[PDB]
C-alpha cells in the first residue's frame, strides 16, 4: 500500500467528490487525464501478467471499461495510468446529447454508481478524426502490448439497429484492435431487446460481413457485450449464436437494472444501470456460465465491481482472460490500477500459478 494509495483513497478523492457532482467530476477527470496530470505509475509489469488473446499481446490484463472515455479524448493518459488496454465509447453514428440531467448518481455506502447517460456521444466522424490523429502511435503501442478497443452504440431515433452498427464497423473498425457490439445498455429503448435469437443472428451476421470486408491490417476482432440481467434462455441462445457465427469474444458484464437487496444509498431507486460492488458477484457468475456454455473456447473480458487482486483473480478463475474496471477508479483514483496489478501478481504466486494464462478458467477444472 503505497503512500499515494492511502492519500488518494482517504483524503484526495473524498474531498473532490464532496465538491463536485459526479458528472462534473467525470468531465474534470477526463480533462486532467487527457493532459497527463497524473501521479507516477511506478509499478513495472512482470512477465506473469502477460496474456495473448484476440490476436494480440496484452502486457497486463487490467483494462479501463467503456464509458469513461466515451469520445476518445484521453487514450494516451489512460495508458500512462498503467492500464494494459483501453476501450473507448460507446460511440453512436450521429452526435446526440443523451438524457436530461441529472443523470449520474453516487451510492458511497455501497461502493456503487447509478447512471442513465443515454449514449451521449460526439458521433463517429468526430471520434474518427481524433483516432486518426494518433493512428500510427497506436500501432506502435499495440505492438508493444497495449491494444485499443472501440465500443459501438446506436442513435436513439434509429429504425434499424443493424445499420447503425454497420456504419460503426465501417468508420471505426479500421482504427481498432477490437470492436464491441452492445446488446446490453439499459438506457436506450429497445437496445437490450436485441435478443430475439434470429434477430440477434441477423444483427451479428451483418456486423461480421462488414468486418470481413476491411483490409487485412485494418480488420479487428468483434466481441459482444451482455448485461447480467439475462434469462437462462437468453444466455443459451447467445452462446449458440456466438459459436455458430464465429464471434471472437464476449464482454461480461454491463451494468444491471436490478437492485439487489441490502443497498443503503439514498439514491438507490433512481432509474439507470447500477455498477460497482453490488454488481461484482452477479457479473462473476455470468462469466462462469458463459465460459461453460461456450466450452472455454470463446475469450471473455470480465467486468463488474473489481477493485482488488482477489476480485480480478475470481473473475479469471471463473473464465475471464482479461478484466476491466471503472467504478473503482472513481472512488480510489488513478492509484487503483497499480494496486490491482500488484495484488493479482502476489495472489497468483501464492496459489501456485505460473502466470495469468495458467489461471484462466481454473475453477472449472476442480
Ligand atoms: C457512468 C458510466 C457510464 C458507462 N457507459 C458505458 C458505455 O457507454 N458503454 C458500455 O458498453 N458500458 C458503459 N458503462 C459500463 C461499464 O463499461 C462496465 O461494464 C460497468 O460499469 C461495470 O464495471 P464497474 O463495476 O467496474 O464499473 C458505463 C458505466 C458507468 C458507471
Ligand atoms: C480518475 C479520476 C476520477 C474522478 N472522478 C470521476 O471520474 C467520477 C466521480 O467522482 N464520480 N463519477 C461517477 C460516474 C463517472 C465518473 C465519476 C476524479 C474526480 C474526483 C475529479 C478524478 C480522477 O483522477 C484524478 C484524481 C486525482 C488526481 C489526478 C487525477
Ligand atoms: O447510459 C449510457 O450511456 C450507458 C450506461 C451504462 O451503464 N451502459 C451503457 O452501455 N451505456
Author numbering: 30 to 395
What does the paper say about this structure?
With the aim of experimentally confirming the reliability of the molecular modeling protocol herein applied, as well as the interpretations of the SAR data based on the results of the computational studies, we determined the X-ray structure of hDHODH in complex with compound 4, the most potent derivative of the series. The binding mode observed for compound 4 in its crystallographic complex with the enzyme was perfectly superimposable on that predicted by our computational investigation since all different structural moieties of the inhibitor were found to essentially assume the same position and orientation within the hDHODH binding site in both the model and the X-ray structure. Interestingly, most of the protein residues within the enzyme binding site showed the same orientation in the crystal structure and the model; in fact, all ligand–protein interactions predicted for compound 4 by our modeling studies were experimentally confirmed. Moreover, the ligand forms two different H-bonds with the positively charged guanidine moiety of R136 through both the geminal oxygen and nitrogen of its 2-hydroxypyrazolo[1,5-a]pyridine group that are maintained during almost the whole MD simulation, thus actually establishing a salt bridge interaction with R136. In particular, the 2-hydroxypyrazolo[1,5-a]pyridine moiety, which is negatively charged under physiological conditions, is predicted to present a similar charge density on the oxygen and the geminal nitrogen, thus allowing the ligand to form a charge-assisted H-bond with the side chain of Q47, through its 2-hydroxypyrazolo[1,5-a]pyridine oxygen. Ring A of the ligand is sandwiched between M43 and A59, while its isopropyl substituent is placed in a hydrophobic pocket mainly delimited by M43, L46, L50, A55, and L58, thus forming lipophilic interactions with these residues. Finally, the methyl group connected to ring A makes hydrophobic contacts with F98, L359, and P364, whereas the terminal phenoxyl substituent interacts with Y38 and F62 through aromatic interactions and also makes contact with L68 and P364.
Human dihydroorotate dehydrogenase (hDHODH, EC 1.3.99.11) plays a key role in the de novo pyrimidine biosynthesis. This latter is then regenerated by transferring electrons to ubiquinone (coenzyme Q), which is then released in the inner mitochondrial membrane, relating the hDHODH activity to the mitochondrial electron transport chain (ETC). hDHODH inhibitors bind in a tunnel-like pocket, called “lipophilic patch”, which is used by ubiquinone to reach FMN during the enzymatic reaction.
